[PDB]
Enzyme design. Sequence first.
Site, PDB file in Angstrom:
ATOM      1  N   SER A 199      -1.678  -3.172  -2.875  1.00 42.46           N
ATOM      2  CA  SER A 199      -2.368  -1.813  -3.003  1.00 42.46           C
ATOM      3  C   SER A 199      -3.408  -1.534  -1.897  1.00 42.46           C
ATOM      4  O   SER A 199      -4.494  -0.862  -2.087  1.00 42.46           O
ATOM      5  CB  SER A 199      -2.936  -1.618  -4.423  1.00 42.46           C
ATOM      6  OG  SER A 199      -3.032  -0.134  -4.666  1.00 42.46           O
ATOM      7  N   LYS A 255       1.307   6.021  -3.373  1.00 41.35           N
ATOM      8  CA  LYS A 255       1.889   5.232  -2.289  1.00 41.35           C
ATOM      9  C   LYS A 255       3.371   5.251  -2.329  1.00 41.35           C
ATOM     10  O   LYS A 255       4.023   5.000  -1.267  1.00 41.35           O
ATOM     11  CB  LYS A 255       1.434   3.736  -2.332  1.00 41.35           C
ATOM     12  CG  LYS A 255      -0.027   3.590  -1.965  1.00 41.35           C
ATOM     13  CD  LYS A 255      -0.450   2.075  -1.987  1.00 41.35           C
ATOM     14  CE  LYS A 255      -1.858   1.902  -1.356  1.00 41.35           C
ATOM     15  NZ  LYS A 255      -2.933   2.704  -2.093  1.00 41.35           N
ATOM     16  N   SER A 273      -3.313   5.213  -6.476  1.00 40.88           N
ATOM     17  CA  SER A 273      -2.281   4.491  -5.612  1.00 40.88           C
ATOM     18  C   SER A 273      -0.890   4.705  -6.014  1.00 40.88           C
ATOM     19  O   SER A 273       0.104   4.107  -5.365  1.00 40.88           O
ATOM     20  CB  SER A 273      -2.601   2.978  -5.551  1.00 40.88           C
ATOM     21  OG  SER A 273      -3.853   2.703  -4.892  1.00 40.88           O
TER      22      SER A 273
END
Length: 244
Positions: free
Chosen positions: A97, A53, A50
């Site tokens: 997340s 991101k 993640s």
Amino acid sequence: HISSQQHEKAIKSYFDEAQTQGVIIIKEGKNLSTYGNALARANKEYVPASTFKMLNALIGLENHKATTNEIFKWDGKKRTYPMWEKDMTLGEAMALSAVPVYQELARRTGLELMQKEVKRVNFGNTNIGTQVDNFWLVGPLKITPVQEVNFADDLAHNRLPFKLETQEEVKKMLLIKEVNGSKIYAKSGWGMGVTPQVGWLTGWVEQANGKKIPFSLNLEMKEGMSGSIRNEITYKSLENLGII
């Protein structure tokens, strides 16, 4: 004052206590300092999970695939976590997340544009493969802990190749803690669909005097370990070193 030897011993212990192997890299101005119980991880490649991101958000906002108040609707299907079964902005999704919202954003950007922007920014090995919606989770995109703290350093100082306003919007998404006039901006990362699993907390401290100290923690995650260990070791390390 405290010796190097003692700082190094303390932060290595944080990792040892967690029964994991990991490194944390701190950067001060131009100088990188590596700490933890497995230093050679500093220049090994792992999936960003993640972490990516932060960059998917930059690419989506810059390319007009979304705005900072667009509400991505939950489609109603069961999600890995209940907290993801809700409508949310990219910022809410950064904090939770929420992988599904960021997979939708990847799919709006599309393979071809995603591969161009990932190249343009020079993130990690820069290779996204053929699947636009999972390349940062399972490969082939990979990045070393050094390239991550360097990525956080560029974001923090507005040096990535995106409008200043794009970078500021994404940094506002990342405030995860205040502790004594210091602000901690970071994104966590847990690649579960890779073996061994990889855990990350990459970000920077903004000190009350406006100075920014980038960091990337990178550790092996194990079945049944809690996700807040990435946070705990990170805050213990930064406080040991007097950064916070």
